[PDB]
Every structure is written in structure tokens, then in C-alpha cells.
Amino acid sequence: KLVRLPGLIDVHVHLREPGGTHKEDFASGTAAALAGGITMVCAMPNTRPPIIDAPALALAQKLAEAGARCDFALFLGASSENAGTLGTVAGSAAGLKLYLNETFSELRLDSVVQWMEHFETWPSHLPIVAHAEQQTVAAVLMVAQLTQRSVHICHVARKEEILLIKAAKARGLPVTCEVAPHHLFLSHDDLERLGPGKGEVRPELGSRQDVEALWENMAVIDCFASDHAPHTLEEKCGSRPPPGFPGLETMLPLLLTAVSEGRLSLDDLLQRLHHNPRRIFHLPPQEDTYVEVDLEHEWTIPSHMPFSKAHWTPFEGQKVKGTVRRVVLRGEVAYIDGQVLVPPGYGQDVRKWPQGAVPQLPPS
Amino acid sequence: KLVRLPGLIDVHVHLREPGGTHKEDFASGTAAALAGGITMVCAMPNTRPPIIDAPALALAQKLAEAGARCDFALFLGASSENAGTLGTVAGSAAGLKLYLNETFSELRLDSVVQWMEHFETWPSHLPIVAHAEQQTVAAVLMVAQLTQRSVHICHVARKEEILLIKAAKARGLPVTCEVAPHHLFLSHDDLERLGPGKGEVRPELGSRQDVEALWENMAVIDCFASDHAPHTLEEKCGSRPPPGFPGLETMLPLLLTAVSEGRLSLDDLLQRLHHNPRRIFHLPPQEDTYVEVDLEHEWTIPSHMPFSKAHWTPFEGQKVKGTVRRVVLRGEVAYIDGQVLVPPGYGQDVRKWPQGAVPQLPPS
Ligand SMILES: NC(=O)N[C@@H](CC(=O)O)C(=O)O
Numbered sequence: 001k002l003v004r005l006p007g008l009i010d011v012h013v014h015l016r017e018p019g020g021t022h023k024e025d026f027a028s029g030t031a032a033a034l035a036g037g038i039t040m041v042c043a044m045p046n047t048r049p050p051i052i053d054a055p056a057l058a059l060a061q062k063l064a065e066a067g068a069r070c071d072f073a074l075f076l077g078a079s080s081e082n083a084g085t086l087g088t089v090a091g092s093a094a095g096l097k098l099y100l101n102e103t104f105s106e107l108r109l110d111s112v113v114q115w116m117e118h119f120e121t122w123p124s125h126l127p128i129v130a131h132a133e134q135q136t137v138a139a140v141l142m143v144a145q146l147t148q149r150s151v152h153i154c155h156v157a158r159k160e161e162i163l164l165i166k167a168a169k170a171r172g173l174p175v176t177c178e179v180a181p182h183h184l185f186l187s188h189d190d191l192e193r194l195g196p197g198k199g200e201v202r203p204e205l206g207s208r209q210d211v212e213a214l215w216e217n218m219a220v221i222d223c224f225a226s227d228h229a230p231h232t233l234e235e236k237c238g239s240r241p242p243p244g245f246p247g248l249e250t251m252l253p254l255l256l257t258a259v260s261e262g263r264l265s266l267d268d269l270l271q272r273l274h275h276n277p278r279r280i281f282h283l284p285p286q287e288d289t290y291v292e293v294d295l296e297h298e299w300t301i302p303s304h305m306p307f308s309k310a311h312w313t314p315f316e317g318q319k320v321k322g323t324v325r326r327v328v329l330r331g332e333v334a335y336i337d338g339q340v341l342v343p344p345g346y347g348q349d350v351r352k353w354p355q356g357a358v359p360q361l362p363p364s
Numbered sequence: 365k366l367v368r369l370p371g372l373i374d375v376h377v378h379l380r381e382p383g384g385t386h387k388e389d390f391a392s393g394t395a396a397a398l399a400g401g402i403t404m405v406c407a408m409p410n411t412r413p414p415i416i417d418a419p420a421l422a423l424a425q426k427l428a429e430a431g432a433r434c435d436f437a438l439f440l441g442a443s444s445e446n447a448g449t450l451g452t453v454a455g456s457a458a459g460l461k462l463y464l465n466e467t468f469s470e471l472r473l474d475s476v477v478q479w480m481e482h483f484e485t486w487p488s489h490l491p492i493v494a495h496a497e498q499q500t501v502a503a504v505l506m507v508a509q510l511t512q513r514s515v516h517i518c519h520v521a522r523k524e525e526i527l528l529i530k531a532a533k534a535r536g537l538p539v540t541c542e543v544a545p546h547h548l549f550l551s552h553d554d555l556e557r558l559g560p561g562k563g564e565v566r567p568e569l570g571s572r573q574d575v576e577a578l579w580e581n582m583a584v585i586d587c588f589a590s591d592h593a594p595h596t597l598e599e600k601c602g603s604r605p606p607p608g609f610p611g612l613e614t615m616l617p618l619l620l621t622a623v624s625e626g627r628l629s630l631d632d633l634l635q636r637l638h639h640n641p642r643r644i645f646h647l648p649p650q651e652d653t654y655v656e657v658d659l660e661h662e663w664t665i666p667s668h669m670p671f672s673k674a675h676w677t678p679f680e681g682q683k684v685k686g687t688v689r690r691v692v693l694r695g696e697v698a699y700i701d702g703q704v705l706v707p708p709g710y711g712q713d714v715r716k717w718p719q720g721a722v723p724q725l726p727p728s
């Protein structure tokens with residue numbers, strides 16, 4: 001007996017195209033998404049070139065329209081030069097991404113004043129998300145309050161961070177957050193097995209106490225999002241390992257295992273992988289779209305999942321219970337039992353759909 | 365013709381006793397203060413032992429009462445273990461000091477949650493000051509807002525920081541700040557002369573643009589304070605140079621030079637070295653206390669000033685116009701033309717004066 005889920009949404013993926021296509025491309029990364037029960041992804045802007053201006057966004061849009069197998073929206077990235085220049089294209093993006101800690105030069109912001117300038121100039125009705133670790137969470141929350149708007153905190157990984165966000169929510173501040181599966185299912189304890197190269201990720205893996213705190217504070221977590229960050233094994237095991245884990249193909253099986261164990265409910269999962277992503281990012285429904293999962297099937301995560309070009313996974317050896325059996329995307333069978341059945345280019349930019357535009361008040 | 369000033373107050377000094385008396389002690393550091401026209405100092409808690417508990421404060425109080433030549437108040441320091449334990453002694457301190465960036469282990473706070481705990485537990489009517497650089501200024505401001513109270517930012521050194529504070533003040537937030545003379549009168553340009561050991565200080569020396577921004581934003585600066593941070597030349601020039609500059613003996617001559625040049629007014633100076641320190645820290649008046657200065661005398665700062673045991677200065681070679689000629693403290697001549705004339709122990713703890721207690725509402 002299969003369970004029917006709505007089309008799940010991952011608001012934080014790195015698909016590497018343009019410029020990093022040996023790591024992943026739109027076609028491979030969206031195959032990975034479909035195999036993970038994900039029918040819509042929001043792609044981060046730290047590509048080569050980075051998506052920090054209109055011409056780069058135009059290029060990325062065409063590459064995505066040609067290569068994506070599931071639907072998508074593309075983030076713009078904040079830079080030290082582009083505040084006040086993105087107004088004409090802002091509404092066509094998923095949102096604006098700020099990289100506020102070490103950054104996998106072009107996206108480096110060297111001053112909180114630059115953060116303020118982005119918060120002041122980016123249209124008020126459109127999303128802003130931040131890579132903001134530890135005290136940086138408090139700092140960006142202060143900027144959001146000074147500019148009287150909301151912010152979404154990416155990949156929360158620490159007890160410190162989730163408790164700060166909890167305190168902010170208790171004061172009625174408009175902040176939301178997401179947590180990635182590696183910060184719920186891996187910890188420092190796993191670094192011996194992973195080794196120092198594979199284990200590199202930002203935010204870094206937390207202590208057992210960090211992991212426990214995220215679970216205890218599930219009510220504070222608005223979304224799950226993979227931070228799918230593919231790099232090849234050669235890169236991860238080489239002399240300067242880049243940070244990041246692939247995660248699209250493993251996220252849902254890990255979380256379904258947790259549901260089966262009673263660690264959270266099926267509804268808790270669907271709020272965090274469907275309803276809250278929709279409402280925070282103003283993402284439209286996908287007609288005739290659903291995912292069928294098998295909750296009884298037990299399996300062990302192998303050394304690499306079938307689709308991501310990363311060709312490795314930090315979850316290797318973990319036992320899971322839960323499998324994606326079939327995905328239907330806009331009336332077509334997109335995935336069945338390991339076979340992707342929609343071609344590159346089937347996916348569409350949801351921000352171009354009438355229902356995918358973010359509502360705003362009219363010029364004065 | 366001499367100009368009579370009120371007794372000036374330095375709210376940020378390191379007097380090194382207990383435990384670092386080769387660098388400075390209460391007797392030498394307060395001689396330095398008097399020679400700099402300063403009649404009251406607030407001493408930071410990063411001594412050995414650090415002033416982080418009642419027994420350490422009791423020791424420091426007696427050492428100060430026995431050694432100080434000018435009046436004083438002693439800060440308590442926040443630690444990872446002492447939130448909620450300082451209530452009985454809090455009112456006897458200058459305030460609570462938080463070290464939020466690298467810290468010249470016992471005072472290290474590893475989580476913003478620990479900052480919140482201090483803001484929640486320290487009595488609401490008493491001062492909190494923070495060493496908070498760059499984004500840490502925004503972060504501690506967020507904690508202050510979440511806990512609905514004020515904060516004072518120590519040694520503001522950067523354009524980024526003063527503009528963030530300016531924005532916070534424009535939003536009516538209760539934040540005040542101080543600036544040290546090295547951040548107004550030295551910059552990166554001076555590092556070639558100083559060398560990498562002598563030049564070490566936290567916050568580090570800023571760019572010319574940082575210095576210019578502090579002057580342009582003088583209206584945002586509530587206090588001047590030396591951050592007198594004495595270390596011997598051997599230490600500064602050795603294999604692991606500690607950060608910090610001595611500054612009590614040079615602060616007023618540098619600032620009087622600026623007054624003479626029309627860079628700020630005499631009143632601007634007295635707001636920042638007298639009235640605003642009094643009002644932010646609730647420090648009492650000193651009866652029969654004043655400073656006589658000569659604004660015409662030109663001199664060049666030598667390789668060391670007479671009193672600080674640091675026995676070096678980063679301002680060596682700078683030409684100044686302005687000299688402290690006489691200081692009277694509570695009716696006694698304390699300093700004349702290079703001679704200190706009050707003994708160790710003349711100084712008193714102002715928090716023990718009836719007028720030096722901070723007013724508060726009565727237990728419910
Ligand atoms: N998280 C990572 O470790 N790496 C991400 C960057 C990011 O999400 O910050 C990547 O793009 O490789």
C-alpha cells in the first residue's frame with residue numbers, strides 16, 4: 001500500500017550549471033530531485049558566472065529551461081556591487097541570497113552596511129534568505145529589524161542558532177528557517193568514518209547536543225531543505241576539499257525513516273517539505289503532481305546514489321525505511337522505481353507562471 | 365592663560381592588578397590617569413584572576429582602594445558560568461563587561477545564548493558594555509532588543525560599526541558607544557612605522573576611510589575612552605605580541621590638539637570625556653575637582669610617557685598642542701607639571717559613595 005504525497009519542494013539546492021557541470025548540471029540534479037520525491041527546486045546563485053546580474057540570470061534561465069526535468073525557480077545573489085541594480089529582474093527570481101560567512105569573492109559582503117543596503121533596496125515583498133551562522137544569525141536579524149522586514153535563515157545547524165530563532169519568534173519577529181538532513185542525521189560522531197575531506201560542510205556537522213536540540217525544537221523549524229551541494233569524490237578527498245554534501249536523493253528516505261520511528265509525523269514532514277516552502281517563497285501549486293512512497297521497504301544507503309554527479313554520499317551505510325516509488329509531474333510520469341521518464345527541458349520556471357508571480361501593492 | 369575643565373572620566377582602562385603588575389598596577393595606572401587629566405577611571409575585569417565572581421571583586425576592591433591615586437569603579441566580567449550569580453554584587457560594579465570577540469578562555473562566551481542569559485539576569489538598571497566588532501555589533505544589538513534593554517559598545521573603530529550604530533540610533537534604539545584615540549589618530553598608514561608587534565591592537569587599526577568616517581560621524585560618538593591596555597615593550601616586540609596600546613597620558617593632549625585645529629569644540633570634548641560618561645554609567649560628581657590645561661604649548665610625544673609601566677607609546681613622534689598643568693582631586697593637588705602629589709590609596713570606589721549608587725525601583 002503506497003502513500004500519496006503532494007509534490008515536494010526543496011528551497012535550497014546547488015545545481016552547478018553554469019560553470020561547474022562536472023559536479024552536477026540541471027539535467028542530473030533534477031533527475032536526483034525527482035528520485036528524491038522532489039518536484040520543484042530553488043537553485044542557489046553561487047555558480048560560474050554567479051547569478052548576480054541580469055545577464056547571468058538570463059543565461060541561467062535558458063540553461064535551466066533546457067536542462068531541468070522538474071520545475072524550478074532561480075535565486076539571485078547579493079554582491080558588494082549589485083544593491084539597487086536588481087529591481088527589474090527581482091520578481092523573476094526565487095528570492096535574494098546573501099552569503100554572510102566564508103564564500104563555497106564575487107559574493108563576499110565585507111560590511112554589515114552592505115547587508116543593510118540590500119535589505120533597503122531589494123523589493124520589500126520578495127524573499128531574502130541568508131547563509132548566516134552562529135552570531136551572524138543575530139546580526140542579520142538585527143538588519144532585518146532595522147529595515148522592518150522578514151528574513152529566512154538557511155541550513156540551521158546548531159543549538160545556539162535554533163534557540164536564538166526561537167527567542168526571536170517568541171518576540172513576534174518575522175523570521176523563518178530551514179534545516180538540512182545532515183544536521184539532523186549526522187554529527188561530530190560521524191567524522192571518524194567520513195574523514196576530514198568528505199566531512200567538510202558549511203555549517204559544519206554539529207555535536208550530538210546540537211542534533212538533539214534541532215529535534216527537540218522541531219516546532220521552530222519551518223522547512224527542510226537539502227542544501228544539495230555536489231562535488232566529486234576526487235574534489236572532496238583532494239588537497240583543498242570544498243564544503244558540501246549531495247542530498248536530494250537521500251533527504252526523503254531519511255525523513256520517512258524518522259516518521260516511521262515516530263520522531264515526527266507525516267504531517268510535520270509535509271508542512272516542512274511542501275506547505276511552508278510554498279508560503280514563504282510564494283511558490284505556485286503544480287497541477288496534476290504527486291509522489292507515491294512505500295513506507296515499509298528497508299534498505300541501506302549505498303556508496304553513491306544513482307543520479308547525482310557527485311557520485312558519493314555521506315549517508316553511506318545508514319539503514320532507512322521509506323522509498324520513492326513513483327512521481328507524476330503535471331500529468332506525466334516523471335520517475336518510477338529508479339527510472340527517470342521525463343527529458344531534460346520538461347521542467348519550467350515557476351516564476352513565469354501567472355500564479356507564480358509574487359503579489360504586490362500597486363506603484364503609488 | 366589656563367583653561368579650567370571638570371574632572372574627566374575614562375570609562376575603559378586596563379590597570380592589570382591583580383596579576384599583571386609588571387605591565388601596570390593601580391598606583392602607576394592612576395598616576396598615568398592624573399597626568400592625562402583624568403580623575404576617575406572604570407577598570408576592566410580581564411585581570412588574573414579575572415573579576416568574574418564575588419571573591420575576585422572583593423580582592424580587586426581592596427587592591428584598588430590601597431593603590432589607586434584617582435577615583436574608580438570596577439567592572440565585573442561575564443563568563444560562561446556566572447550568569448545569574450552576580451546579583452548581590454552587581455550594584456557595586458561599574459557595570460558588566462562582555463568580551464564577544466577573541467579573548468586579550470575564562471571570559472570566552474561560546475554562544476549567543478550565553479549573551480542572552482547575561483542580558484536576562486544582570487539587573488536591568490545597571491550598565492552592560494561589550495567588546496563587539498563588525499557584525500558582532502549588530503548581533504549584540506539584537507540580543508539587547510530581544511531582552512528590551514540598552515547596551516554600550518566599546519572602542520568603535522570602523523566605518524561599518526559607526527554607521528550601524530547611527531542607523532540604530534535613527535530607529536530610537538538605546539545604544540551608546542565610545543571611541544578610543546588610536547582609532548581617531550592612527551591608521552593602517554602607521555603600521556610600517558609601528559611594526560607588526562607594536563601595531564597589534566583589538567580592534568585593529570583601521571583604514572584612512574575608517575578614521576575619516578569616525579570624525580565625520582562625531583555626533584554618533586557618545587564617549588571617548590582610552591582603552592588603556594599596557595603591555596611592556598618586550599611583550600609587544602616578542603614572539604606572540606599581546607594586543608593593546610597604553611593611552612591615558614596621551615589621550616587628552618591628542619584631543620586638545622584636535623580642538624585647537626577646529627576638528628571638534630571644547631564642549632564636544634567635554635560631553636565625551638565628562639558628561640556622557642557620567643550619565644551612561646551613573647557616575648557621581650567629584651567635589652572640588654578640576655583640571656587646568658595649557659592649550660598653547662607645543663610638544664612632541666616622546667618614546668615613552670612618564671608614568672605607565674608600559675614604557676612605550678604608539679603615538680611617539682606626533683606633534684601635539686595641549687598640556688595638563690594641574691589636577692585637583694577632592695580638594696587636594698593631585699598633579700602639577702609632571703609630579704603626582706597624592707599617594708597610592710588616595711583614590712576611592714565611587715560606587716560606595718551614596719551618590720554613586722545607581723537608582724532603581726523598589727522589590728515589588
Ligand atoms: N554548504 C556547503 O558546504 N557548500 C555549499 C555552499 C552553502 O550552502 O553555503 C556549496 O555550494 O557547495
Ligand SMILES: NC(=O)N[C@@H](CC(=O)O)C(=O)O
Binds near residue numbers: 378594608
Ligand atoms: N584592546 C586590546 O588590544 N587589548 C585589551 C583588550 C580589549 O580592550 O579588548 C587589553 O586588555 O590588553
Ligand SMILES: [Zn+2]
Binds near residue numbers: 155202203
Ligand atoms: Zn550556505
Ligand SMILES: [Zn+2]
Binds near residue numbers: 227
Ligand atoms: Zn547552499
Ligand SMILES: [Zn+2]
Binds near residue numbers: 495518519566567
Ligand atoms: Zn576590548
Ligand SMILES: [Zn+2]
Binds near residue numbers: 376408593
Ligand atoms: Zn579594553
